[PDB]
Amino acid sequence: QSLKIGIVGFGNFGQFLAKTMIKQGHTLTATSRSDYSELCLQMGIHFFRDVSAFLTADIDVIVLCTSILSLSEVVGSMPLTSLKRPTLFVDVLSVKEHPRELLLRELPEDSDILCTHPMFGPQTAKNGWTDHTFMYDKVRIRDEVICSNFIQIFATEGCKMVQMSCEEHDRAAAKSQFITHTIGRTLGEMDIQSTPIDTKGFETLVKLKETTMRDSFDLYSGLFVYNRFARQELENLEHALHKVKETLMI
Amino acid sequence: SLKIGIVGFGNFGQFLAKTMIKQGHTLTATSRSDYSELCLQMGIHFFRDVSAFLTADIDVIVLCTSILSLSEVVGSMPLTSLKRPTLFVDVLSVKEHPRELLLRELPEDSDILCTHPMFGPQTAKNGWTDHTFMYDKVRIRDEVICSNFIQIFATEGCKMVQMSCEEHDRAAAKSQFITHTIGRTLGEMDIQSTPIDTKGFETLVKLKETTMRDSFDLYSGLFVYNRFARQELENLEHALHKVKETLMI
Numbered sequence: 277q278s279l280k281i282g283i284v285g286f287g288n289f290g291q292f293l294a295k296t297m298i299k300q301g302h303t304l305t306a307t308s309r310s311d312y313s314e315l316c317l318q319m320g321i322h323f324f325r326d327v328s329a330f331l332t333a334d335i336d337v338i339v340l341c342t343s344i345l346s347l348s349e350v351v352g353s354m355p356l357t358s359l360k361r362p363t364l365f366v367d368v369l370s371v372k373e374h375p376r377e378l379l380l381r382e383l384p385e386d387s388d389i390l391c392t393h394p395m396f397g398p399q400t401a402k403n404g405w406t407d408h409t410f411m412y413d414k415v416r417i418r419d420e421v422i423c424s425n426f427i428q429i430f431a432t433e434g435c436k437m438v439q440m441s442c443e444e445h446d447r448a449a450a451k452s453q454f455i456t457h458t459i460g461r462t463l464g465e466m467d468i469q470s471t472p473i474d475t476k477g478f479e480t481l482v483k484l485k486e487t488t489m490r491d492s493f494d495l496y497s498g499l500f501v502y503n504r505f506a507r508q509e510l511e512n513l514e515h516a517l518h519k520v521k522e523t524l525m526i
Numbered sequence: 527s528l529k530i531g532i533v534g535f536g537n538f539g540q541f542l543a544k545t546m547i548k549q550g551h552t553l554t555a556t557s558r559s560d561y562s563e564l565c566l567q568m569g570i571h572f573f574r575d576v577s578a579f580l581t582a583d584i585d586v587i588v589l590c591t592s593i594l595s596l597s598e599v600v601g602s603m604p605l606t607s608l609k610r611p612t613l614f615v616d617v618l619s620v621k622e623h624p625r626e627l628l629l630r631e632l633p634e635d636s637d638i639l640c641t642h643p644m645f646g647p648q649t650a651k652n653g654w655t656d657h658t659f660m661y662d663k664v665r666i667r668d669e670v671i672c673s674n675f676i677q678i679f680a681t682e683g684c685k686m687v688q689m690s691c692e693e694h695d696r697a698a699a700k701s702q703f704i705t706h707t708i709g710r711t712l713g714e715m716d717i718q719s720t721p722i723d724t725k726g727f728e729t730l731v732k733l734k735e736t737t738m739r740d741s742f743d744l745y746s747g748l749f750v751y752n753r754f755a756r757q758e759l760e761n762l763e764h765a766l767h768k769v770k771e772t773l774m775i
């Protein structure tokens with residue numbers, strides 16, 4: 277079940293995924309806006325600076341690891357008629373309705389589509405993926421063997437496997453992940469600092485701030501701009517805070 | 527071994543009593559509501575009337591009533607009936623208020639130790655080790671009795687932090703008050719675990735659950751009686767507004 281995997285977008289998270297893929301024995305190719313030639317040499321990954329050359333490589337699965345905000349531009353730049361054979365496309369964006377809609381619209385019809393979200397990354401799964409959650413939606417799967425072998429990348433690492441529609445993911449993510457990152461960035465803007473008398477609860481907010489601020493602002497913007505349920509959750513958070521505040525006035 | 531009397535035998539008074547009894551101190555309690563059966567079960571004497579509590583043989587009185595009620599509670603106590611100088615300890619989650627109130631209202635010859643265990647039944651269910659205990663020796667003349675009592679927390683492995691009541695309230699406004707405001711906010715949102723919780727969201731769900739175990743009175747006291755809390759609420763509100771603005775454009 278060893279795969280030839282091509283990563284599009286070899287940034288923070290693409291690198292994180294590649295480390296575990298290499299550990300399992302997969303054969304990796306990568307392409308990206310920026311030049312990762314030296315890092316790919318270190319890791320044994322075949323890097324293509326040009327996406328046209330990448331698309332003609334011997335690849336079983338293409339994994340889209342670019343930012344949510346850039347996905348449309350990146351897919352638009354792909355000469356998808358250069359694809360040598362029907363290929364499974366996987367995305368790992370943190371929102372799901374958008375890539376599902378875009379890939380259904382832009383990809384060749386005979387390319388399969390697996391829309392996924394590993395609910396973890398470099399800050400929470402440094403030391404392994406065990407008992408972290410991996411979400412997927414089999415948007416357009418006809419070659420079940422290749423789809424199963426890819427999904428098994430996360431199952432063998434002990435991930436909790438969750439099959440769910442892209443819409444149900446975005447509904448749940450707006451209420452959970454988006455709220456969490458919003459609070460983390462709020463604490464970052466406050467620049468909360470440890471004191472000599474931190475409660476355990478506050479220590480957990482300091483660490484949440486620290487971990488949240490490791491992610492790019494692009495990523496946070498994508499969580500809001502491309503999740504149609506995020507706006508209501510932002511309102512719910514503000515509405516809740518003002519309800520609490522007004523109890524203090526009264 | 528100390529004769530310790532608890533005033534306010536609620537949630538946190540009961541929590542402190544458990545450990546104080548384990549250490550071999552002799553506990554008595556009094557309180558607005560009746561705790562006769564609970565004190566029977568725990569093996570300590572409950573006084574329904576604060577007057578009989580105050581004329582007992584007692585080394586330390588620990589004020590474990592809500593921040594909001596401290597003034598009414600102290601005002602109702604017939605403090606001149608104390609048989610001898612007695613150490614008063616408060617464990618309120620804010621400090622400038624009890625310091626100023628006790629200095630004003632207590633008999634001059636009673637000592638005052640203002641403290642804040644930075645923990646409670648949710649975060650220290652299984653022991654006090656490496657939890658922080660703040661104290662300010664506001665008016666100590668009997669250093670032996672004060673050192674005993676302080677040792678209650680030291681022997682449990684607490685991180686012992688001496689610091690002024692004002693410096694406590696400045697730091698607490700920035701830390702505890704902010705944390706509990708966020709917890710209450712998540713309580714009003716009624717945030718719920720999903721099949722795809724991130725680890726960070728799991729931490730917020732637990733913060734919500736832990737925060738909602740405390741009384742609204744307690745939360746209200748963190749704000750009303752910490753003169754530094756209002757600006758920290760502003761800092762939180764202003765920061766969320768700034769985060770929202772980065773999204774709305």
Ligand SMILES: NC(=O)c1ccc[n+]([C@@H]2O[C@H](COP(=O)([O-])OP(=O)(O)OC[C@H]3O[C@@H](n4cnc5c(N)ncnc54)[C@H](OP(=O)(O)O)[C@@H]3O)[C@@H](O)[C@H]2O)c1
Pocket residue numbers: 284285286287288289290308309310311341342343344346349350368369370371393394395396397398399491492494495498
């Ligand atoms: N814990 C995580 O970070 C995590 C977890 C799960 C899922 N995800 C998702 O994984 C993806 C990558 O996340 P990330 O943490 O690496 O950070 P990110 O800031 O969301 O994305 C960084 C990647 O996006 C590329 N990129 C950004 N703008 C681009 C543009 N105009 N044109 C072409 N490429 C562009 C970058 O390319 P270059 O590096 O070549 O410049 C880089 O590879 C995102 O979709 C994210 O939502 C992240």
Ligand SMILES: NC(=O)c1ccc[n+]([C@@H]2O[C@H](COP(=O)([O-])OP(=O)(O)OC[C@H]3O[C@@H](n4cnc5c(N)ncnc54)[C@H](OP(=O)(O)O)[C@@H]3O)[C@@H](O)[C@H]2O)c1
Pocket residue numbers: 533534535536537538539557558559560590591592593595598599617618619620642643644645646647648740741743744747
């Ligand atoms: N983890 C914690 O909960 C924690 C940790 C550190 C410090 N503290 C501080 O410990 C103290 C007690 O906290 P708590 O958790 O037990 O909850 P709390 O709601 O702040 O206070 C409960 C106590 O206040 C008494 N009380 C409330 N209103 C009263 C009134 N008008 N008149 C007379 N007594 C009144 C209650 O008496 P009855 O029960 O008899 O009705 C009860 O004993 C507070 O000052 C708190 O700030 C709490």
Ligand SMILES: N[C@@H](Cc1ccc(O)cc1)C(=O)O
Pocket residue numbers: 369370394395396397398399400401487491724
């Ligand atoms: N990067 C953080 C948080 C995160 C998780 C999932 C995401 O899709 C985005 C961010 C982590 O490693 O856990």
Ligand SMILES: N[C@@H](Cc1ccc(O)cc1)C(=O)O
Pocket residue numbers: 475618619643644645646647648649650736740
């Ligand atoms: N009751 C919670 C939070 C708390 C801590 C200290 C306080 O003063 C008040 C509340 C705990 O056990 O930690």
